[PDB]
Ligand binder design. Structure first.
Ligand SMILES: [Mg+2]
Ligand SMILES: [Mg+2]
Ligand SMILES: [Mg+2]
Ligand SMILES: [Mg+2]
Ligand SMILES: [Mg+2]
Ligand SMILES: [Mg+2]
Ligand SMILES: [Mg+2]
Ligand SMILES: [Mg+2]
Ligand SMILES: [Mg+2]
Ligand SMILES: [Mg+2]
Ligand SMILES: [Mg+2]
Ligand SMILES: [Mg+2]
Ligand SMILES: [Mg+2]
Ligand SMILES: [Mg+2]
Ligand SMILES: [Mg+2]
Ligand SMILES: [Mg+2]
Ligand SMILES: [Mg+2]
Ligand SMILES: [Mg+2]
Ligand SMILES: [Mg+2]
Ligand SMILES: [Mg+2]
Ligand SMILES: [Mg+2]
Ligand SMILES: [Mg+2]
Ligand SMILES: [Mg+2]
Ligand SMILES: [Mg+2]
Ligand SMILES: [Mg+2]
Ligand SMILES: [Mg+2]
Ligand SMILES: [Mg+2]
Ligand SMILES: [Mg+2]
Ligand SMILES: [Mg+2]
Ligand SMILES: [Mg+2]
Lengths: 78, 178, 141, 98
RNA sequence: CUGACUGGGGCCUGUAGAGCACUGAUAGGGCUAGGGGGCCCACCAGCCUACCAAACCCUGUCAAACUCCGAAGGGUCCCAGGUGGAGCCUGGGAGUGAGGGCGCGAGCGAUAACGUCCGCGUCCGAGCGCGGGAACAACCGAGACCGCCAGCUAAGGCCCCCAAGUCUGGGCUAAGUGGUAAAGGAUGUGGCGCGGCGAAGACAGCCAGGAGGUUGGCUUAGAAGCAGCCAUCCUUUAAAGAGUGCGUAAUAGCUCACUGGUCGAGUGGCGCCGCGCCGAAAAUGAUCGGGGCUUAAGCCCAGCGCCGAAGCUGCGGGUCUG
RNA sequence: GGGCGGUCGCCUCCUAAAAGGUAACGGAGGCGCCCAAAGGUCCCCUCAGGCGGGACGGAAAUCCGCCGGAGAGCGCAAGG
RNA sequence: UCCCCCGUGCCCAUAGCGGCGUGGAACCACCCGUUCCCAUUCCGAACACGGAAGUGAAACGCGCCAGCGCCGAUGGUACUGGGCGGGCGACCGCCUGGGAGAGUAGGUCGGUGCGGGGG
């Protein structure tokens, strides 16, 4: 007659942290993702927990186009 | 048959459908022209003039359009039509759903079922000249166990047959005993 | 009564009752239909009480059609119990219905007998349920 | 539907493509995400020698001197359908160095 | 000049909605791995299953923990507007960490609570200062610096307490509905559309031979139209069934569905729609604030005015900031 | 309301209102570990099922061919 | 300044699936062997090597077929920021913008780069 189950985990708080059209530095996390919802393009590196970040600085761009997954492209400025 | 038409130029029409003037649109290959028809004329002819009959539509340009219905959107807690999609037929074997029916003793009338699966006789495409008004299906002896239709004896006179399937057709169900 | 034999989870929520119909206005099975007009719930006791009131009314012919299925567990706490301490027990599965949805559809019953039978089963439900016949208002092209 | 796809990684952005047919071979050098073939050296387009595995030395010197003639050094090497065995086209000029 | 907010461009989501292709449940119909099994046969040499039923395909569905789909919105970044008790950085100084109401999106509850707990916003708290709602913090308007025997308005009203129309029109309600709530019911009225009939005479009326095979057939006593069965008739006629309700144990009988006239110009079934009636019985004295109100002093669509705050302007005076 | 009962930390899904967060004695479940390979690099292959068969074989052991684009598997509950 | 074929791409099922053609002078594939460099929990099937006497059957390209699959228009609501009201409640109505998912018409069995071979 008691409460069977009333606990819940603390949120790890994932999500897209840098959208496109944003000037970034070398090292900014583009997206905190649980699984690899985004695939690395140019100048994009993954880590341990599928987190991809920028290798250089510039204006970032998404969706080169599909059929393999969503793309992240850190494009440098010239 | 013999229904009037008008024009629409991107109006309000939720405010126009208060006096029994529901909107519409007709086409055969192009010219998606927005019209509105009258509700007691369209409803009164639409009492018996079903999908099989070619409802013709007088237009202020002087043309008589051989149309039919594509869908009647039910008002869904009011039981009314919002918008009816007309379909002009052209020189093309267009698609038709003909409400055929059943005549005869169903299953030996005392030991009879229901024969409720009408389902609008799934599809028959036709030229505009060989289009029918009524095709008859008999139910000569079809008692409870055997003798089902199975669309094998579904050869209509002429044009055309059912295209892909032969599976949806009426059958005999047992009654509700106490 | 009747109940779903398998579920993913036992208890679930209530929600709201808005929306028009989400399907279920065209009859497509029988020649008549008992269509609802007010949003409420349909218990399995309301299903049984309306289903018995057909087969006991008309006999030897006419198949009855039901197009309602209870998948929502009505959750009620026991009597003289304070608030909290989890949800209550499950007593009977209810069925959410929307206005303008056709619930009961008679088959093989005539006009003056189907109006009467749907009139008898109309009083077994807490909803204003009017009666519609077979019209040309199908979804065919 | 056989494919190995060692051409999918592309960390180095400049590769030398190799195709080995059962008659002879031919090779290209592609620039990635642009779609422009810079230089190539093809057997039976220059018809160097009959034996198919003796091609790799002369097309290695030929594609090497045409690569240095076009002024590209930092290149790479694909292994899409084929093992690094048999023909090698080994070179000592250009940054492939294998 | 970056800020709240807004405009022009991208990016993101998986909620509302919708859907079954995925995860499960499912109302039927067809096909039938097979199984109590087999009509029962040298067992495979079957046959229909009115026996059950796997899996598959259609007509149909449901989902916070399902998404092939998928907005309105929100967030973020670039440019522009935005000089505002706007923002940004540092330091000093408190208070708060019992909240509550309302509308929406929700959970628990019982789709109960002026009930509990979140989010989006407002208000009270801290504006119990003001006007309306009779009185009342969160329902509406409005953000009170002070003063004037000045106007215009917001919400709400214009029969009197109570300041302003017994205003001008078109209908509606006979219940004090207004001024207390549901399922259901009823020639209550007013409006729209369909059908039949009709002055080759229509409805309710008053008179009529209101019938012959035929008590059709063991119907278990009894089946004459009338407890309940078959497969449902025909012919005599200027109109009549295997009968509309009684009445009989069954009879008999009374009324008929169907129709002939001397009459008389309209007559029934409906499907919506506005306001109504019953359902509606609690405990000190009753009432919509009260008196009263019926071509209204209620209800629906309008129009011209007026009353109406501490709101705004007319004027004077003080303070604070630039 | 307190006591009795249940819970005290971490993870997964929903509630949770399409950025992030978000409560209840709200619903459904797991954990206090394990792998010298169940790690790194390099090189080969594509799964689970269904159909047609087999010599045993439950309708699942092992083998062949076709269909099968991810319904399998990824140490462990759930999600990606 | 063009057609055919081979590599390598970008569009992300309008590119595939299934059926019907067609091609080897020219590439490519098939084939004949394994003798060595190589390999197989086993085998030259797949990697590797000599070839190349025979072939386009299979696979591979091009062309056709809309049903199989996919994409999918104008209206019309569902829904909803925002504002205004109704119902005792469950929940609805109007205006202003925005605007789906199914379904219907229809479309398709490809479009477009770079470098080579032959005419
Ligand atoms: Mg493949
Ligand atoms: Mg590989
Ligand atoms: Mg290979
Ligand atoms: Mg600015
Ligand atoms: Mg900003
Ligand atoms: Mg904006
Ligand atoms: Mg959802
Ligand atoms: Mg939903
Ligand atoms: Mg947007
Ligand atoms: Mg401030
Ligand atoms: Mg505290
Ligand atoms: Mg607190
Ligand atoms: Mg709170
Ligand atoms: Mg409270
Ligand atoms: Mg409440
Ligand atoms: Mg305040
Ligand atoms: Mg007070
Ligand atoms: Mg007041
Ligand atoms: Mg106040
Ligand atoms: Mg002030
Ligand atoms: Mg005034
Ligand atoms: Mg006065
Ligand atoms: Mg009342
Ligand atoms: Mg008047
Ligand atoms: Mg002021
Ligand atoms: Mg002044
Ligand atoms: Mg979220
Ligand atoms: Mg949100
Ligand atoms: Mg590993
Ligand atoms: Mg209720």
């Amino acid at each position: 007659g008691s409460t069977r189950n009333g606990r819940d985990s603390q949120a790890k708080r994932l999500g897209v942290k840098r959208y496109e059209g944003q000037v970034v530095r070398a090292g900014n996390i583009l997206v905190r993702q649980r699984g690899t919802r985004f695939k690395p393009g140019k100048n994009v590196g993954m880590g341990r927990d599928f987190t991809l970040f920028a290798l250089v600085d510039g204006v970032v761009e998404f969706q080169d186009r599909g059929r393999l997954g969503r793309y992240v492209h850190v494009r440098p400025l010239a | 048959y013999r229904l009037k038409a008008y024009y629409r130029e991107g109006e309000k029409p939720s405010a126009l459908r208060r006096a029994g003037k529901l909107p519409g649109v007709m086409y055969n290959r192009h010219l998606n022209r927005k019209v509105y028809v009258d509700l007691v004329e369209f409803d009164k002819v639409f009492r018996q003039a079903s999908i099989h009959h070619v409802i013709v539509l007088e237009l202020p340009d002087g043309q008589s359009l051989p149309t039919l219905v594509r869908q009647v959107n039910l008002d869904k807690r009011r039981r009314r039509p919002e918008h009816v999609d007309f379909f002009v037929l052209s020189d093309e074997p267009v698609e038709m759903y003909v409400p055929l029916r059943f005549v005869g003793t169903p299953a030996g009338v005392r030991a009879g079922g229901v024969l409720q699966e009408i389902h609008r006789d799934i599809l028959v495409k036709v030229s505009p000249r060989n289009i029918p008004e009524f095709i008859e299906v008999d139910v000569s002896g079809l008692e409870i166990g055997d003798s089902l239709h199975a669309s094998d004896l579904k050869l209509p006179p002429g044009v055309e047959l059912a295209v892909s399937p032969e599976e949806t057709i009426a059958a005999v169900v047992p009654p509700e005993d106490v | 009564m009747l109940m779903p034999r398998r579920m993913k989870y036992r208890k679930q929520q209530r929600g709201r009752l808005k929306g028009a119909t989400k399907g279920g206005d065209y009859v497509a099975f029988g020649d008549y239909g008992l269509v609802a007009l007010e949003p409420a719930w349909i218990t399995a006791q309301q299903i049984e009480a309306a289903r018995v009131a057909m087969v006991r009314h008309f006999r030897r012919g006419g198949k009855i059609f039901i197009r309602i299925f209870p998948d929502k567990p009505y959750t009620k706490k026991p009597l003289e119990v304070r608030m909290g301490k989890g949800k209550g027990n499950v007593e009977g599965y209810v069925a959410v219905v929307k206005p303008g949805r056709v619930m009961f559809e008679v088959a093989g019953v005539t006009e003056e007998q189907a109006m009467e039978a749907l009139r008898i089963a109309g009083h077994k439900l807490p909803i204003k349920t009017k009666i519609v016949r077979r019209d040309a208002y199908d979804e065919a092209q | 539907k056989f494919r190995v796809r060692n051409r999918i990684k592309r960390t180095g952005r400049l590769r030398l493509s190799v195709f080995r047919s059962l008659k002879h071979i031919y090779a290209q050098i592609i620039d990635d995400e642009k779609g422009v073939t810079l230089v190539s050296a093809s057997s039976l387009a220059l018809k160097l020698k009959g034996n198919k595995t003796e091609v790799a030395r002369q097309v290695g010197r030929a594609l090497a001197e045409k690569a240095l003639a076009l002024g590209i050094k930092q290149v790479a090497f694909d292994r899409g359908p084929y093992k690094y065995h048999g023909r090698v086209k080994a070179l000592a000029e250009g940054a492939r160095e294998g």
